[model samples]
Target: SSGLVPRGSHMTAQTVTGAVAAAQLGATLPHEHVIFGYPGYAGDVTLGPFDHAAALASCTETARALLARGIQTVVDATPNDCGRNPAFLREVSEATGLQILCATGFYYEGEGATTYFKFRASLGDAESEIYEMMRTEVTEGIAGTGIRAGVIKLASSRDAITPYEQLFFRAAARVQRETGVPIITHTQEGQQGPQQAELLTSLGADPARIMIGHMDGNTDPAYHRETLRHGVSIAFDRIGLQGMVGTPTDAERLSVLTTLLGEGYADRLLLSHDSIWHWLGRPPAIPEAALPAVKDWHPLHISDDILPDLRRRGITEEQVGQMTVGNPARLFG
Candidate 1:
């Protein structure tokens, strides 16, 4: 209710954070997952899948922790294809007393693969779908109710490029062209970064207005900076989440930031946890133990457990400030 604005009209002053000014205001983690269930989330949540009550409970706890850390607003990156629910976001924001920004976009290998896959239309093919999402969900409201999306999300699996992805890029471009809303992306380990940008850029989207995610997946710092040079966001945001190419350590992530900053690209970087629905179910990635019992573990717990250690290791408050605040405001603006 505090930061909430009229659907999507150049975000109001609610965008304050503790970083730019102080702990009292202006520091927000732009890229994060608040209420994600992935209707068909990668991995075996398929067994019993997510427990809504349990998931929301964990989110409440996470929210409280972030709030204590001075994170006033959390841009929920759970896109539509990733099982996002606006009503769910409203609930979490209310419960946690935090400003929540939601997104709408297509996902990797979306629903109706065999049956709907062939019949499946590209996001470009479905311009109305994109516009409706922007208008109803973003500009006006969603589901005819009025909950709006503050951002736009798009993604492709680690697999490879597909017609579906192109459609999404075009749709994202269309939305940006029509409403000027910036775009966020889920690249397959950063491999998709350039390609996704190519599609969006081809569609006339500003490179600076786009954020290509999972940058930590890109082990090469040069490549990351190169992407940043293109005016696109290079995010190593997932400091804790592990999967493809393994999540880089907090230090490694910082090292990349330092290099980019030295190169005069600090304003283009963003940070986040990208933690999926916390799981008592199974770990998002495999531990070295390779034990089935240990599967479905949530890494943010360790991050939450080790943030202090990260500080001791030379990650300055300003670095965190840049990643969490400065960069997002610059790009999202």
Candidate 2:
């Protein structure tokens, strides 16, 4: 399936420290938010005020822990509208010695619809504006920090692809075509993956360079396979999250993962725990009780727990490597 990039392609990914060879991205957690401050409309009023010191401390410790466990790279998929702080990310990367790649793009409807992006989308030439933002971020840098984004992050709602979100997808596609950077998406509840793949590819993005994330939110194996058939990667990224109304737990996620592996689609998958180590506005708006259930929702859970389960189930080491290593290398290539 052309999962690995050609040897010696000279392809490199943009990290907080600067560009590095794509091959240097070892055992990456393809999707995770190290620092997020996405405070929505009632923002501080409802979610509590942001505490910068506490957030940075928590994120630094998380990054250090992940680095100690052999995760060499991380893509912070926090969209700009969601309070993305490239400078803080750089700090965390420096602290942990982990390669961190931040994103450049808008999020999906619910969170995105309320942000300045929505206002911009209401104007004429909205696509052009969005396109310019992403292209500049990749070519230049974000917010004058001179830290460029290695990937374009876009998102869509579960039931329908909103018009505003479509503008984001088109802009992301344009940026991908121009910069050769990869595209990662947030697919709410695992719906709209096929639509996302279709939109990006039809808009001239190479399917291989586009990853449909959050595919683990739905347990239907056929749904995942359908998305992969479009020749794109699927992220079983929400690994440690548990007991959400429509979300699958680690067991359901693993079941679907192994089933896909059995079907020889190993190279088409990426694994992570869309874990949020630091909350943006305040603590998450979720119930207090639900916090304990997601206590283990860290990047290490996959290496610590899921891999052993895969071994017991007879998933070969080669396949595991493909998901954790080879596929991410190719995605960033």
Which model scores highest in lDDT? 2
Compose the digit string of candidate 1's lDDT tens values, residues 1-333: 222112342433222111122232355666777655544454555664667787788887877777777666777777665566777667777887776677876666643122242353522345555556555565676676567676787777665656656655676777777676767877775576766767777778777567888787777787786666566776666766544345555556656666666665656777666765563334355556544222322324334543455456565667656666766664554
TM-score (C-alpha) between model 2 and the true structure = 0.93
Candidate 2 clashing pairs, residues 3+ apart or interchain: 36-280, 37-280
- TM agreement with the true structure for every prediction: 0.77, 0.93
Stretches of candidate 1 exceeding 4 Å from the true structure: 1-25, 41-52, 110-118, 122-124, 243-252, 278-316
Model 2: which ten-residue window has the lowest total lDDT? Answer: 1-10
Q: What is the C-alpha lDDT of each candidate?
A: 0.61, 0.83
Off by over 4 Å in 2: 1-10, 41-49, 113-115, 285-288
Residues 1-333 of candidate 2 have per-residue lDDT tens digits of: 444342332268898779978689998999998866554633565546667688778888888888888889998898887778888889888877888999998778776635566677667778899899999998899888889998999999888888888888888888787777889999998799888898888998878788999999888898988898788999998888887666777888888999999999998899999887877665666678788568668778998998889989999999999889999888875
**lDDT of model 2 at position 80:** 85
